Amino acid sequence: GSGIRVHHIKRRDIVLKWELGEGAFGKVFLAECHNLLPDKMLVAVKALKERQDFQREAELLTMLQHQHIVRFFGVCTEGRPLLMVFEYMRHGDLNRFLRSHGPDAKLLAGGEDVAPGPLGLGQLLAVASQVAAGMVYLAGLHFVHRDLATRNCLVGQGLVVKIGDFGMSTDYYRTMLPIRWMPPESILYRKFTTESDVWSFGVVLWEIFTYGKQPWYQLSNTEAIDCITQGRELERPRACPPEVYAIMRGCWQREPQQRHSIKDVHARLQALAQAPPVYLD
Numbered sequence: 347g348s349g350i351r352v353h354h355i356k357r358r359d360i361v362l363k364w365e366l367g368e369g370a371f372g373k374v375f376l377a378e379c380h381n382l383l384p385d386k387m388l389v390a391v392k393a394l395k396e397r398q399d400f401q402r403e404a405e406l407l408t409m410l411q412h413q414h415i416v417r418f419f420g421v422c423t424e425g426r427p428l429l430m431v432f433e434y435m436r437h438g439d440l441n442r443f444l445r446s447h448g449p450d451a452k453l454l455a456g457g458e459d460v461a462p463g464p465l466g467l468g469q470l471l472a473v474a475s476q477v478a479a480g481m482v483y484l485a486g487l488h489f490v491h492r493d494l495a496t497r498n499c500l501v502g503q504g505l506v507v508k509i510g511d512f513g514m515s516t517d518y519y520r521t522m523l524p525i526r527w528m529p530p531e532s533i534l535y536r537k538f539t540t541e542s543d544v545w546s547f548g549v550v551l552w553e554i555f556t557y558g559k560q561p562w563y564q565l566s567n568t569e570a571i572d573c574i575t576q577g578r579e580l581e582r583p584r585a586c587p588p589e590v591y592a593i594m595r596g597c598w599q600r601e602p603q604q605r606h607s608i609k610d611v612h613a614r615l616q617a618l619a620q621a622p623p624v625y626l627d
């Protein structure tokens with residue numbers, strides 16, 4: 347049948363090195379690949395635990411290509427396990443990267459490409475702008491991401507940041523809803539739209555400027571649901587300038603239609619990134 351051509355990779359061409367991570371996304375390995383882009387190169391490989399969903403995912407991953415979507419190279423389906431092959435993002439998921447650079451961080455981090463310790467305001471803004479740029483692309487295709495959160499973004503060489511997992515853990519509530527990232531219309535009416543992604547992106551913005559804290563971390567899942575549906579908003583992070591907090595708050599309008607577009611949000615973030623406001627205290 348007709349569909350997107352998905353690149354296939356021979357199995358003897360993939361040499362698994364070791365596991366990088368486990369979780370809701372499956373098992374991810376570091377691997378060498380021959381011959382992807384002409385000689386040998388590191389990639390990330392997702393090995394699937396347990397068939398039909400895989401091909402659909404591979405098709406969609408093939409379609410969704412952007413500077414701020416993690417590069418997908420193709421699949422290996424000759425024998426088990428099924429493999430999906432990605433560019434290797436050397437700094438891992440954005441939530442852990444943020445935490446390792448937070449003030450609270452227990453150890454020093456890096457990396458010859460990024461300084462250890464807290465990120466600059468300009469860098470935090472560059473991280474936010476890049477995730478937004480990714481979201482602009484997806485909204486342009488009417489792709490709705492139902493689990494936008496820093497745990498699903500990846501950080502590569504020199505602080506390039508990309509959306510890393512599409513969602514096709516205490517951050518979830520029993521399906522599993524990333525309830526702390528969800529807008530009122532999702533919780534109340536089970537509606538999720540591109541405007542709902544603007545809300546979630548507002549929460550991502552908060553994650554970034556708290557160096558990866560969990561939204562409403564003091565509260566239970568039902569208590570957080572109470573906050574979200576009663577109109578209580580996450581407080582301004584100490585490292586977050588008032589200009590950036592105004593952007594978050596624009597994302598958190600109760601009425602979806604009064605939230606600013608992701609295009610507008612990205613534009614304001616990128617402007618700040620190019621000229622970061624002075625901010626202390």
Ligand SMILES: Fc1cccc([C@H]2CCCN2c2ccc3ncc(-c4ccccn4)n3n2)c1
Nearest residue numbers: 366367371390432434435438439498499510511
């Ligand atoms: F946005 C996420 C969050 C978590 C996992 C992924 C996985 C599943 C889909 C693709 N992917 C990738 C793709 C490339 C890559 N380079 C390094 C890593 C990685 C992953 C976990 C821990 C350390 N490193 N990854 N991970 C994406």
